[PDB]
């Protein structure tokens, strides 16, 4: 397989990916980074949506 084919297969399985702890942690980190970016831009509307999404994704055990 080529590198591009590997990336395509990984994206396909990510679309198929229901949940994975490593991927959930990565998604939460990316969401936190996006939230701080929105905070620095004084966007009070996006930050509410990002906070709601973070609350929904979180609550681990």
């Amino acid at each position: 397989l080529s590198n591009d084919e590997v990336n395509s297969i990984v994206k396909m399985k990510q679309s198929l990916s229901s949940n994975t702890g490593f991927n959930t942690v990565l998604k939460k980190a990316q969401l936190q980074e996006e939230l701080e970016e929105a905070r620095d831009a004084h966007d009070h509307e996006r930050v509410a949506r990002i906070e709601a999404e973070l609350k929904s994704i979180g609550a681990e055990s």
């Binding site: 590198n3 591009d4 990336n7 980074e33």
Partner: protein, 45 residues
Amino acid sequence: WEEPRLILDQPAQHDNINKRYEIRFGKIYLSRPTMTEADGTTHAM
């Protein structure tokens, strides 16, 4: 911002046209650390 201006000037006669070329430095934007692979894809590190 300690040195916020780079200035070049030129009195063109080649009609006296004094042209000043100046560039200013603005905000600083930082990001979270990121890894850029050889293939081209970038991801959080």
